[PDB]
Amino acid sequence: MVRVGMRAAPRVSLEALKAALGGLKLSEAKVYLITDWQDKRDQARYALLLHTGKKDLLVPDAFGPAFPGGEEALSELVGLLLAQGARRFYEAVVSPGEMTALLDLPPEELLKRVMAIANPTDPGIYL
Amino acid sequence: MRLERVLEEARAKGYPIEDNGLGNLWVVLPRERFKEEMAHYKAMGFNFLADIVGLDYLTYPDPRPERFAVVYELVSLPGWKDGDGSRFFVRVYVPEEDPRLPTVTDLWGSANFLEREVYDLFGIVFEGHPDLRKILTPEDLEGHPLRKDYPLGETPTLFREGRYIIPAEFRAALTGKDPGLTFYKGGSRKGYRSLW
Amino acid sequence: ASSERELYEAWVELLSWMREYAQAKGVRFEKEADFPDFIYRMERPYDLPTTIMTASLSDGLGEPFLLADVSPRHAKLKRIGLRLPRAHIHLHAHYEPGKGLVTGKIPLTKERFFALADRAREALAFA
Amino acid sequence: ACPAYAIYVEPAENDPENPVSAGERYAKVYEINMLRCIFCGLCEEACPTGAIVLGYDFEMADYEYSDLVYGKEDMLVDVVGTKPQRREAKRTGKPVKVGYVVPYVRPELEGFKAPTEGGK
Amino acid sequence: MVRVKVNDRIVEVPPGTSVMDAVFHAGYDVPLFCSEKHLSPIGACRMCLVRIGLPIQWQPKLAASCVTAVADGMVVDTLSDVVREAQAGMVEFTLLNHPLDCPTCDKGGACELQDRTVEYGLYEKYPLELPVYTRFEFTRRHVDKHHPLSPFVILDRERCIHCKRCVRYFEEVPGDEVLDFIERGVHTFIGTMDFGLPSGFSGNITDICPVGALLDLTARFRARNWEMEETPTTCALCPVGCGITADTRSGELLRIRAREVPEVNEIWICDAGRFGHEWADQNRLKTPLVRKEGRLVEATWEEAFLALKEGLKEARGEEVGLYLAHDATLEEGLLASELAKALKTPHLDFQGRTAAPASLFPPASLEDLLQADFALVLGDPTEEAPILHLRLSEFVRDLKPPHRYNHGTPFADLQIKERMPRRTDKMALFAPYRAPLMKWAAIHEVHRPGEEREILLALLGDKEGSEMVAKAKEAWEKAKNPVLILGAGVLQDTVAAERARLLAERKGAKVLAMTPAANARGLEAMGVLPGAKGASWDEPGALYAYYGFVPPEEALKGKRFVVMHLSHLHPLAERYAHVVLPAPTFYEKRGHLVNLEGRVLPLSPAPIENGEAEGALQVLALLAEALGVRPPFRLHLEAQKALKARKVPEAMGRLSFRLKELRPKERKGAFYLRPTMWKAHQAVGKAQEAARAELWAHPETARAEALPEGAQVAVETPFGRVEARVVHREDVPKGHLYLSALGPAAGLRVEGRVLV
Amino acid sequence: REGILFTTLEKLVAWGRSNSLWPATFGLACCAIEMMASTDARNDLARFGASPRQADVMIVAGRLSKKMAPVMRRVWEQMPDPKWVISMGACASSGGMFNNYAIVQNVDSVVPVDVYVPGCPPRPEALIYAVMQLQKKVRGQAYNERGERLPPVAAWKRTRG
Amino acid sequence: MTLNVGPQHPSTHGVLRLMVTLSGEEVLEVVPHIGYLHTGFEKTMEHRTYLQNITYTPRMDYLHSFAHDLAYALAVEKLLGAVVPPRAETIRVILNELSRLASHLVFLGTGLLDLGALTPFFYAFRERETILDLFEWVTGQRFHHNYIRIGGVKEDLPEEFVPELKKLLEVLPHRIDEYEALFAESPIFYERARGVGVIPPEVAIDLGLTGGSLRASGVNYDVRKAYPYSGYETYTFDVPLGERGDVFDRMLVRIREMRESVKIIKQALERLEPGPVRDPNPQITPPPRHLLETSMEAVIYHFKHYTEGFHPPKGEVYVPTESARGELGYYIVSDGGSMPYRVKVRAPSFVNLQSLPYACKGEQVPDMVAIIASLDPVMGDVDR
């Protein structure tokens, strides 16, 4: 597993992600959005784990309306997953306290935890 | 009467016999003799195959011979041709690094779905099966959910102002290998049984 | 008998006296404990005049120089006692009907109590 | 006691001058997530003081998730209504009528006023 | 080993075994109140009662398994109808006078009484008979309730079951009888005539109490035992790195407790460690600030990285200072080290860096200090390395590490007798004042600051010391296997430290070196010390700097660009700093530390509310970009790879690292900074008054500088201006002023003045 | 034209819809059987379609398994447009008493929820309360706790896509 | 034509997915696909107290829930060796059979609707409503009632339950007959159901079809009879049977079962006298609520019981029970912890389904619907 990005910094993270995906076709990939708090999307923060199936990618919590210009970044993220033909979007709910510890765990463990907790989600809510 | 003929047979061939005074009885056959012996079991007059119950003993306080163990429930229906009402468990231990076991599909078509379930939830593959397809867990689910090393997968329960509960950090109840909240546990909390 | 009731009423009485000596000298009074048979009384009925089981007079430092208590509504051989901390001093109040509140055969008047409390404060109270 | 883990209680110390409960301790927060809640009443059954006791209201359907996590001050015996009910009854100024009637209220609910039977 | 059989099973077990421990070692169990790990069993609560045979020949009356020795070929019965009946009985006697507080009790889910009662209690009498819980239908004992004993400790006299655990503890382990029973019979109760609860170790009794009589006030009425998320970690407040457990629920630190780890801290924590948690979850900085209009502004991490590229665009790589925390992780120390290798710079240092590296000396293990023949002490153990006080309390009573059972540490160590006699001849202590421990030191001397060096010289034998110092010399001579313990004055002055190094080298003798920095020896071991040019942590040398703490103001003054990575917000920074950033406490960190004994310890992260805080690993990684260098470490795991390549051992492994280099610094004697337990950043809440600064002077010289016994005096140090209550002490050398060094600035001698 | 832009006309159509609210039930667990009670007592609702095509109101009644989510997704998408979603019971609304690998911990993940209805199962009359809610919700007669008036159709608010 | 009958549509009942391999109007083979309701109790319950689990037990077969309640309660009581009071046992047979009448009422309501027409769902619903009102009266809940306890049952029956059980016990004989009246003399249904749905006993046995859809093909096996538990051993008890297993016979058998159930209700109702209601062993049963204001031991045990709960011996256990869907039982592995080490639930509805590719093989398509309703599945039991 690769880890790119840094916590709480939306535009740098988006530019880096755009760099890293490339001409990879995503039709068999699974997209996991890691967040705390089910109800309130307005003050939400978002981290992302992408399981391509041939390799995995982690981004910390740099996304969402929680940070300035963050909403537009999450929206373009999901739009971009959608363009490469990613379809299967999932939402994972962690304790705020977890979020820092979760991404400091080793790749395999973090990934199994994420797939265990993740809820199938409409890509449209992040647009 | 058909049960006696099973136990008497197991004692001679060196098969260990488990008994709880609740009225439940087991017979553990080795891996080798399993397929054939059990073929003989249906042949022995065993109409009905009730269960295939998979067990993951990873987190069980005492050790057992191998990590996973499967229990079949064989019976002869009491209202049929000549039914005893003889019902009993046959247990077969299975290696962690070798989740193999012959199906009794040929024998009972009961063996069909149940062995598939035990494949889905635990990694155990059943030989000679018509179709081992994943049964229960979502198509794109990765792994085998009910085996102990696999997360129950809880999500925090949610309240008002930054307030959360993490169930696994909330739990008052202790498991078998749990210490408890004092220096140790003795007595009833190391296990208890009333005496009728 | 129903002497019980007059006892609880008299207990309320003694509490009143403690509160007074407290304000008078500018020295702390404290309500120590309420009745389990009130707290943990749920729907169950409660007729007692107060819900209060234990009280004390503390000095500046909060260490008590005088202690006072009554039996729960449900206990055998009901008494109200007084204890002087550190001094090994124990007193038992009964109630004889028509006479009043007595320690054995000696009447327990408010005055007697105030004197006992002052001796207590001056001797025992640290600040 | 809660199998759904739907009850959050932040605890607190009674003020001698002006008390809340009968011990030295009371409930600073009581939240219940109705959406998390399964409605066993293991909470009531666990409750030592007969504090928490399930009621009679069912008209609690509401539009927003977080409006559905009830607090202490929505649950006390004096209160008549559910959240959307009461909110409609303020935005209308037309009083609450619950859509239920009972023969009587349990001993454990004592103080809870309800429309009953022909007792009224 | 002595052959014992408990119930259905047989055990090997060393001769001096407590029957209780042979019981538990066989994997059985038996009620336990008065006896405690590391405490004298005295069959007191009489819970542990079992049966013993010696041939089938049963003894007439029951043995308290806690206070019974084991004999060769002995039998022990714990499940008999008669035993279980007796156990139930003692339990009923204990429950007899108790208060009825479970729902409302802070002892909540984990009460030795609750659990023992539910384990062994109500024996089965012989159906669905309707049975009675309670026989006794009379009035209970009612006494004083909810009584604060100290800003940190609360007392319920009703709950107390009169095991001896707290009083026993106070006399045996810390050695301060500030607690004992009062009257007798059933009237007996806990009280004190020493009101403060004076000891700096007082909070452990909260852990020991099998019931809720003694509870932790800083964490009173917060959450129930089960309800906390409990984060096992290690305490970074000083170099001994006790195991702790940081209870947090909903982002906030509720309560710190002791985590037992018999190699180093045993079952005990110090008051500053445990109650000094008030500040970590309390008032803390959650976003990056930038200087815009002569002042600070709340900003994105992005905008501040722009600011950061900007401020370093014009900067050459040897002008940058790199400065870490006394508690900085091995990963942070190592990555800072590797980045300053890459970016050629002469000055990188850490907050409690001592003129002489603690690496000079061979690390000593704690149990080595148990086995040693003599202990030579210069510096104050109580204040500099606090639980060392307690291990020296083990040392003095001749106690030595127990045989290790299947339930681990013995429950009743037959080896600890109650009320033990103490040797004064086993050690020599030399302190700048009459140290607390001077009670137990026959050879003991109050010296003054920077006088260590001359005691050490005397020990080497190049001159003749006082009566005391010649006695000390001679005892260390005759000492076959002594340990030398050295403080700040030793370690903060090159020559003293070298003489120590020398003496302790000549006789093959290990050292326990008390650094004002917690992670000092490891940060040293990751190669974080100043270089040739030599701007040190307190020196205004660099032109551009990164700071992980708050420096002397004389250091900040002058600099071109300054970037601080803190947890709370300092006033000293909003007038001197160009960029501020959020950091996690050690409570919420993840990474490694090195003990003053050379052991590597884990910090797990606590779910405290960090806000948008980030570990220094990430910050350094990000600060390297604006400078051109690409860093070798980003995250914890890769940092682990590089650490492991660097050959730092598994956790609980010892790291061996010596060093032979000194950086001396002159020390300007007017004021001394007394090394203190309580840390400056800890004075919040109830720790408010306890972490107060003090100024001590001999009443004569006090009188000269006009300093009254209760007064809050203003003081200026190069380390900043601190108010301090004035305490008169006749064991303090005349002509000096001891100011509480509530930081890792301890043991430094400084200019300054009492401002009026 | 979505029921909009004449004060007379939109109100008229909006009643039309609210009182017409045409439930398309999507049964899952025991909650579905608790809605089959609702079928009895019912009086703007309980004619179906049943076929999704023909209905405005989608009733999610029961635990929605994770494997089941993409299905319900298309059923919702495969509804005509002026459409509403009621979420019935704890399992649906939040994760319920089953907090785990198996089950969606809020149905609002996959389909835009209009109204939520707590209970395990909720009494049927509560679901009447919810359709009266949703009745009066599409009348634009509905408010949350913050003071805000609520939109007739949620999933007029999600980005489709 | 491999026709794809979807998950929830079109009226393939209870969220099943069916790949009817079918050319024409017959049925070649249906390749069944399940798992859409999988909640994962067997894992979840490893994380709940034995008490806590009693809230999760009714929730699988939600029609006959109390059979879950009964099976689990029993297997634990056995495992920890608890003694259930006679009046509790009687009430448990009453509730079990009443919940059975509820379940059955539902089964035939849906069946008659499924192919054939609408009307009789309503009368069955009326009687079911009287039953649910009974349950609400006693447990405060419609279903998923948290009532049964490892000792016994949560509390006693109120004054008003007895009178109301009689009312329904009065109308039901006439009532059950009215449903029967329409059916037994089946107008179209006869030419609709008599031929369809083939069940050989030998294959029922080979594929393991236990659940009362077994006796409709002429094998005589009832758990209340074959392996008696709760004192069914002591009742006047008729077990209805079928001739050759079709749709029709299954369908009537359960209707007979309803009057016999009602006869068990009346019978048990006769034998009921005042007493206590759960096993007083405090290890097993939380203290009386009244003395929480007096006894130390009470409070300790209350607190402990409702937090940690209790620890049964290390052991495995299982007991068989009869639901309206067949053999049900809990296989409980306890490790001596406060929560079960593992609970595997023997799901009758799960084994019963191996015989549908068999059952509807060669049948009609309109009938392929009816032949499903006739097998009476409940998916909560299946997926689980």
Ligand code: SF4
């Ligand atoms: S009824 Fe009580 S115990 Fe049960 S889920 Fe609701 S809050 Fe929890």
Ligand code: SF4
């Ligand atoms: S000390 Fe223990 S037994 Fe007593 S009230 Fe507290 S928790 Fe209960």
Ligand code: SF4
């Ligand atoms: S206060 Fe606690 S530790 Fe001290 S004697 Fe009493 S019960 Fe034992």
Ligand code: SF4
């Ligand atoms: S002795 Fe040192 S390491 Fe231990 S708790 Fe106290 S400050 Fe922390």
Ligand code: SF4
């Ligand atoms: S909320 Fe309750 S009634 Fe509804 S599906 Fe979930 S378990 Fe069943």
Ligand code: FES
């Ligand atoms: S007597 Fe207290 S444990 Fe031995």
